[PDB]
């Protein structure tokens, strides 16, 4: 359920002559890829993940102090 904007396809690179946009080539491979990944975690990673909201959940953490 993760997703990322890689950019705007450079077939649109001339929508305008200047725009604040990151034009990238269309993917040259298959549009769908299936990969076997063996993923490791530790019981401590589970401790940390269950004790407190982590990463992009904990945006207020940017304030530091408490």
């Amino acid at each position: 359920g993760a997703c990322k904007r890689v950019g705007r396809s450079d077939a649109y690179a001339t929508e305008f002559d200047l725009e604040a946009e990151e034009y990238v080539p269309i993917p040259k491979g298959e549009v769908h890829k299936k990969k076997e990944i063996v993923q490791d975690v530790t019981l401590h990673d589970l401790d940390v993940a269950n004790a407190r909201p982590q990463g992009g959940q904990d945006i207020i953490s940017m304030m530091g102090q408490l």
């Binding site: 077939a11 649109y12 690179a13 001339t14 929508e15």
Partner: peptide, 11 residues
């Protein structure tokens, strides 16, 4: 009937 011409909208 010479209505076979086609325009485009891609940049």
């Amino acid at each position: 009937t010479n209505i076979e011409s086609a325009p485009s909208l891609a940049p």
